[PDB]
Short mmCIF file of C-alpha atoms and ligand atoms in Angstrom, two decimals:
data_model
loop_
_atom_site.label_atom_id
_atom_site.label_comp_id
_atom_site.label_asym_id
_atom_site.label_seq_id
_atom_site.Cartn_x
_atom_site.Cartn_y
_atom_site.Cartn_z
CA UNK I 708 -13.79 23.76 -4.37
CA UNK I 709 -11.27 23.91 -7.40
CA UNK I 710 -14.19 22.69 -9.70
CA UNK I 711 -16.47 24.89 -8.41
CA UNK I 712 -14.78 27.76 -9.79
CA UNK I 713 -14.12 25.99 -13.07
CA UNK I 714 -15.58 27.85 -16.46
CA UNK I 715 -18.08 25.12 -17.66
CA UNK I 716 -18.71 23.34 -14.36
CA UNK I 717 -21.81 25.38 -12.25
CA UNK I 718 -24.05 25.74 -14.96
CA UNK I 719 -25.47 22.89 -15.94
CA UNK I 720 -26.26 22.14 -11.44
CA UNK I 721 -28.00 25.58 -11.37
CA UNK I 722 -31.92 25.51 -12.02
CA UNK I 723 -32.23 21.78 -11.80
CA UNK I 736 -25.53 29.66 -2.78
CA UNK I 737 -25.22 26.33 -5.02
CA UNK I 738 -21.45 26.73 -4.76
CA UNK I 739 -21.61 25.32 -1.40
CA UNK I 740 -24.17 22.17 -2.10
CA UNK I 741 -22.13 20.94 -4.16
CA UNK I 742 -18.90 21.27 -2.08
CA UNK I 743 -21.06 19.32 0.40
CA UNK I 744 -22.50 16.47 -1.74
CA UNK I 745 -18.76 15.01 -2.95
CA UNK I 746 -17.35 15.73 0.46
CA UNK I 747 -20.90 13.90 2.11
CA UNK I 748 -19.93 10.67 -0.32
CA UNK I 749 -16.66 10.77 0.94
CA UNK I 750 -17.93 11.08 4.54
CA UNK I 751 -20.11 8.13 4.34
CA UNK I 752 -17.79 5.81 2.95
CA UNK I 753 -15.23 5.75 5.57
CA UNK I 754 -18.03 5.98 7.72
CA UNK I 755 -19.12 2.26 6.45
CA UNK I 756 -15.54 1.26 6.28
CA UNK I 757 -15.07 2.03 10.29
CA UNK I 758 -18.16 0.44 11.31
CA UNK I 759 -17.15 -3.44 9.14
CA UNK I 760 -13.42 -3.80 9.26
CA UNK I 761 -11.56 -0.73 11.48
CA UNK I 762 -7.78 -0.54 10.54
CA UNK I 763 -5.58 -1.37 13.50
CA UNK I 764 -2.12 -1.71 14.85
CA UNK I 765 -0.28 -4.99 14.19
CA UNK I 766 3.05 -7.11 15.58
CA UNK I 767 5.23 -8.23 12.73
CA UNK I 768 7.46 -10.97 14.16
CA UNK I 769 7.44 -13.85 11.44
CA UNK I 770 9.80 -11.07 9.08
CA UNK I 771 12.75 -10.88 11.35
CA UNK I 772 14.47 -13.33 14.27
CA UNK I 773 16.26 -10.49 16.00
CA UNK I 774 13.07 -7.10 15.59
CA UNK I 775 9.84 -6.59 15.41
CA UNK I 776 8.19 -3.49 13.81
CA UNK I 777 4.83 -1.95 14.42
CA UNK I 778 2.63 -1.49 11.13
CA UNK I 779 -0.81 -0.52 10.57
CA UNK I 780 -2.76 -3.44 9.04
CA UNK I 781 -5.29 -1.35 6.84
CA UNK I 782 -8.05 -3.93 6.48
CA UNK I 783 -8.99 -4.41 2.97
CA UNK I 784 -7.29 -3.11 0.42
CA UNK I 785 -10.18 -2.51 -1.81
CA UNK I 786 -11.46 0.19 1.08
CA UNK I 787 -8.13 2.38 0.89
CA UNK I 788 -8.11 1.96 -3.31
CA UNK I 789 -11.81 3.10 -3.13
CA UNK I 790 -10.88 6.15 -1.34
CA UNK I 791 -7.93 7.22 -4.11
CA UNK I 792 -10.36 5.91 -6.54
CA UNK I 793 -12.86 8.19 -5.86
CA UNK I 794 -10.34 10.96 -5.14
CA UNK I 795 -9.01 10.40 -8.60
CA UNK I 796 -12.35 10.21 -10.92
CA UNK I 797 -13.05 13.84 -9.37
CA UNK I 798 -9.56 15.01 -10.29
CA UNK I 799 -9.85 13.46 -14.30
CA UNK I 800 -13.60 15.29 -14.00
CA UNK I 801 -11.80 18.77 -13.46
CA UNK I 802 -9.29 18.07 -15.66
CA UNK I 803 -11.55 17.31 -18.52
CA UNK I 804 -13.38 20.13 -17.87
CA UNK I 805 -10.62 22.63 -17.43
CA UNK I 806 -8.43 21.36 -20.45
CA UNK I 807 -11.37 21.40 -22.89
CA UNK I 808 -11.23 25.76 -21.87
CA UNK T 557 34.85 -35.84 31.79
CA UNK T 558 35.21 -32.36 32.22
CA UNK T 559 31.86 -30.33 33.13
CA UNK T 560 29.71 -28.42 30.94
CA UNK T 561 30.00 -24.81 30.79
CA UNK T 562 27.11 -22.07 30.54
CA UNK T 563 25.67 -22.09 27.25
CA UNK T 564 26.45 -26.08 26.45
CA UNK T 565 24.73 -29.12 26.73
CA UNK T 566 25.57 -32.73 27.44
CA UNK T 567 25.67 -35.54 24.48
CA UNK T 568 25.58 -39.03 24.57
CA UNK T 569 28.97 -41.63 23.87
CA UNK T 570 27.53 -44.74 22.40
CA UNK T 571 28.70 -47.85 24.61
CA UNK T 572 29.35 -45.92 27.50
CA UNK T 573 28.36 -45.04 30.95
CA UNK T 574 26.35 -41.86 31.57
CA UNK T 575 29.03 -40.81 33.80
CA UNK T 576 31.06 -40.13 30.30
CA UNK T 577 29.55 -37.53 27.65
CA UNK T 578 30.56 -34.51 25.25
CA UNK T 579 29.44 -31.27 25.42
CA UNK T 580 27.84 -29.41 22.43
CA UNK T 581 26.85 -25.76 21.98
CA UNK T 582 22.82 -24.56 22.39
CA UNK T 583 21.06 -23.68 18.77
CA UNK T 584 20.62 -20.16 18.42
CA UNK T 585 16.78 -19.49 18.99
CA UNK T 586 17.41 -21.11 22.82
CA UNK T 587 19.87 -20.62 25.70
CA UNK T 588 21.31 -22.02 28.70
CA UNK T 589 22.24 -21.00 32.47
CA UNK T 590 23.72 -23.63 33.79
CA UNK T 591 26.56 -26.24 34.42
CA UNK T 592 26.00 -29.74 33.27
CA UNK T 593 22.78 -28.92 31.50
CA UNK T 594 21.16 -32.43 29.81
CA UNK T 595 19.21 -29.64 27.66
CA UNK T 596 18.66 -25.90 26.46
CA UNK T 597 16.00 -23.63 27.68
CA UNK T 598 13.91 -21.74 25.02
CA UNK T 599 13.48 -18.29 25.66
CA UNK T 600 10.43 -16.50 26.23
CA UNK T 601 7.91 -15.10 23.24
CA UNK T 602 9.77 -11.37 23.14
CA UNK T 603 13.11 -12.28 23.67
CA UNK T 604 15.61 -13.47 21.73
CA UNK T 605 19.09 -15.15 23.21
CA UNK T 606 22.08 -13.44 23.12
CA UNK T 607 25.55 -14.13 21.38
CA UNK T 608 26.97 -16.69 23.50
CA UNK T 609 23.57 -18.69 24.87
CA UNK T 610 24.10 -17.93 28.67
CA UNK T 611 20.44 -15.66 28.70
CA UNK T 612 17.75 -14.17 26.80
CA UNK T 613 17.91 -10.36 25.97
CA UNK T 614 14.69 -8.03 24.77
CA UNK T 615 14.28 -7.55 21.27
CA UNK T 616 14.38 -4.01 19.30
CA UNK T 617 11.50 -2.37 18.11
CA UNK T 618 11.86 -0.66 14.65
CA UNK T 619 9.26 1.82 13.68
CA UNK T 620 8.83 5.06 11.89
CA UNK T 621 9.34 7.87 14.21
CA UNK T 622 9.81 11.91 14.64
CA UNK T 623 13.69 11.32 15.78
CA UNK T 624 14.72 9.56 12.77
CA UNK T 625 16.97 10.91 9.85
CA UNK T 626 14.22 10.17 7.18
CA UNK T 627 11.29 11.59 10.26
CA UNK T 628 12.78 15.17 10.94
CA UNK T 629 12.59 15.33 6.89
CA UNK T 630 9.50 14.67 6.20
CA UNK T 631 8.40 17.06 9.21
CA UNK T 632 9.50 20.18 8.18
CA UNK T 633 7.98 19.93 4.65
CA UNK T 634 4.82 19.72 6.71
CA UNK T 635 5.34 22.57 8.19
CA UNK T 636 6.34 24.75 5.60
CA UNK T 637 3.14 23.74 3.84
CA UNK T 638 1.78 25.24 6.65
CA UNK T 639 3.54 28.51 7.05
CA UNK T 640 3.07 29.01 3.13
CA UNK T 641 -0.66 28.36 3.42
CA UNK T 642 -1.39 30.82 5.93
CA UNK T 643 0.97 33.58 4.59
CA UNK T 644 -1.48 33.41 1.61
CA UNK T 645 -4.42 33.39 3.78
CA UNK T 646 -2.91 36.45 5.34
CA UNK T 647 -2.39 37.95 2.14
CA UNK T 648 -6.20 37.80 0.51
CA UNK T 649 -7.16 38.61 4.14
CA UNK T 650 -5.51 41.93 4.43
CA UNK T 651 -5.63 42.70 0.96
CA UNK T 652 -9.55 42.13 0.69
CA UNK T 653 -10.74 45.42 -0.69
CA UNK T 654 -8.22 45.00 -3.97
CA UNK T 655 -10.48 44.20 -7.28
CA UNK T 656 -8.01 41.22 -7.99
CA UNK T 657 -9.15 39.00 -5.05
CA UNK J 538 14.06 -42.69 18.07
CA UNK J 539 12.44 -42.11 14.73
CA UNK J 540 15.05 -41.00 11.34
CA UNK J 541 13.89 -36.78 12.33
CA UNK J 542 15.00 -37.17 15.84
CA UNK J 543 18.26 -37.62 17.81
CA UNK J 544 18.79 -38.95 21.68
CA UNK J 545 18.53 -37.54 24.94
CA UNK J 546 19.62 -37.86 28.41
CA UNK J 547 17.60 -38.79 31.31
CA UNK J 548 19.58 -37.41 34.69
CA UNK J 549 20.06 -40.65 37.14
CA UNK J 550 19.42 -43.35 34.88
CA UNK J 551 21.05 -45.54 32.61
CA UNK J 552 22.15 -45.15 29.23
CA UNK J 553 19.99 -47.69 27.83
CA UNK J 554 16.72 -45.15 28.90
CA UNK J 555 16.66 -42.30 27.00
CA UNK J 556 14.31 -39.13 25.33
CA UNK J 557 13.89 -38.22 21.51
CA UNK J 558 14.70 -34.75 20.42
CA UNK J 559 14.06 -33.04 16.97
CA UNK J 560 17.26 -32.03 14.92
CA UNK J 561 17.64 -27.96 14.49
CA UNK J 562 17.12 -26.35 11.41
CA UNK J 563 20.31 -26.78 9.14
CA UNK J 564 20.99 -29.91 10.81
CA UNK J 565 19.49 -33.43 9.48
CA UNK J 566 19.54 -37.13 10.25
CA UNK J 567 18.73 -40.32 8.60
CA UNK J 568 19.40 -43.46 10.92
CA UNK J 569 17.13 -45.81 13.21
CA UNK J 570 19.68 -44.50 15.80
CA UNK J 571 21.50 -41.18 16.05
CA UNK J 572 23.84 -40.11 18.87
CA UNK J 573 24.08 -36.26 17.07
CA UNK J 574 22.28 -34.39 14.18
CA UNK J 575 24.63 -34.52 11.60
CA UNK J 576 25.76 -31.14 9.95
CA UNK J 577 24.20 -30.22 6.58
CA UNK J 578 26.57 -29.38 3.72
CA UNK J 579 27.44 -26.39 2.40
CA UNK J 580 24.75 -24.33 -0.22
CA UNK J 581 22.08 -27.42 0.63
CA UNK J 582 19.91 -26.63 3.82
CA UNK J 583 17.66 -29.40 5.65
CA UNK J 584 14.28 -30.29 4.55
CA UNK J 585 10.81 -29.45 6.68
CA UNK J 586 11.15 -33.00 7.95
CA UNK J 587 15.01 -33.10 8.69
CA UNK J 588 14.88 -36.66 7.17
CA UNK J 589 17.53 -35.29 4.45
CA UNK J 590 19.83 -32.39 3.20
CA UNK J 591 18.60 -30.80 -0.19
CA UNK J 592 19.78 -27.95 -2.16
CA UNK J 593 19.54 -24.08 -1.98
CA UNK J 594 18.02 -21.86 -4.37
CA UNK J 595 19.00 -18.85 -6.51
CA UNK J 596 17.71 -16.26 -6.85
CA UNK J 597 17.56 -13.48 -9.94
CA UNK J 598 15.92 -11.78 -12.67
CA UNK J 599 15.85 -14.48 -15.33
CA UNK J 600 15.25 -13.87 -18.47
CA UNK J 601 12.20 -16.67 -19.03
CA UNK J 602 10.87 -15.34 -15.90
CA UNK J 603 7.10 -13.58 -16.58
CA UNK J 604 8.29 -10.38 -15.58
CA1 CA C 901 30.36 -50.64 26.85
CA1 CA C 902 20.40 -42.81 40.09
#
């Protein structure tokens, strides 16, 4: 949404109620890939004993972690995107 | 000899008769409940022997959680988010006929 | 009993009958024979095998270290 109302960012979508398409293309990628994620390798819970003799603590295994850098990864190459755009005005 | 207590276990005299033994304290990862024990139990997968090896006692489960110095904390941040979101909500909301917004 | 293990007690038999039981960790032996798992010294700790004591290691931020 904060691109959207960026000065040099609508322009160059319109002639290829816009505003809204393209808040739901980037959040429709985002969608889909945790989508994908859920269906291969769902995060779980987990039982740590082998780290201490006396307690146990509950984690969250997260699956792999190329899934939860994808999701900052993506995050971030939108944030540099408006950021580019923004500083350049 | 002089029995065993809870929590020991019997060891061998070389060149003597069994009647005659020592008696040496359990390890610390097993336990024992008995007098004149030749060995010492292990305790079960989730519990974990106590100071002096007479019994196994439940372990302690250590996790992040809402009554926790470092949980209330983080909470309340939260929640402020919150409040300060929809105060500005409120704000463009009932100001929505002003030229700025 | 093999050089890892130490002796055991049967209940109602005689002493020349016996079990063999691993050494703890910490704890080590080395004969054909052992009546007890001898104590390691102090700063060495028992290998996997408990065949022998070997030193401990320290631990800090050297300076040849990679990092
Ligand atoms: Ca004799
Ligand atoms: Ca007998």
């Amino acid at each position: 949404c904060i691109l959207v109302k960026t000065n040099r960012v609508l322009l160059v979508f319109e002639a290829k109620n816009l505003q809204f398409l393209l808040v739901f293309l980037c959040t429709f990628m985002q969608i889909v890939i945790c989508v994908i994620w859920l269906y291969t390798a769902p995060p779980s819970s987990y039982r740590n004993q082998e780290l201490e003799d006396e307690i146990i603590f509950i984690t969250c295994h997260e699956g792999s972690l190329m899934a939860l850098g994808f999701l900052i990864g993506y995050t971030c190459l939108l944030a540099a995107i408006c950021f580019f755009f923004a500083f350049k005005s | 000899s002089r029995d065993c207590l809870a929590g020991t276990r019997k060891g061998i005299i070389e060149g003597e008769p069994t009647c005659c033994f020592e008696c040496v304290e359990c390890p610390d990862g097993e336990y024992s409940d008995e007098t004149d024990a030749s060995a010492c139990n292990k305790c079960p997968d989730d519990f974990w022997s106590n100071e002096n090896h007479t019994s196994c006692i439940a372990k302690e489960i250590e996790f992040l959680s809402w009554t926790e110095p470092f949980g209330i904390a983080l909470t309340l941040f939260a929640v402020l988010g919150i409040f300060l979101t929809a105060f500005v909500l409120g704000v463009f909301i009932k100001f929505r006929n002003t030229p700025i917004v | 009993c093999l050089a890892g293990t130490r002796k055991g007690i049967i209940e109602g038999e005689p002493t020349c009958c016996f079990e063999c039981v691993e050494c703890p960790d910490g704890e080590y032996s080395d004969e054909t024979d052992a009546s007890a798992c001898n104590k390691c010294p102090d700063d060495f700790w028992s290998n996997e095998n408990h065949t022998s004591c070997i030193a401990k290691e320290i631990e800090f931020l050297s300076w040849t270290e990679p990092f």
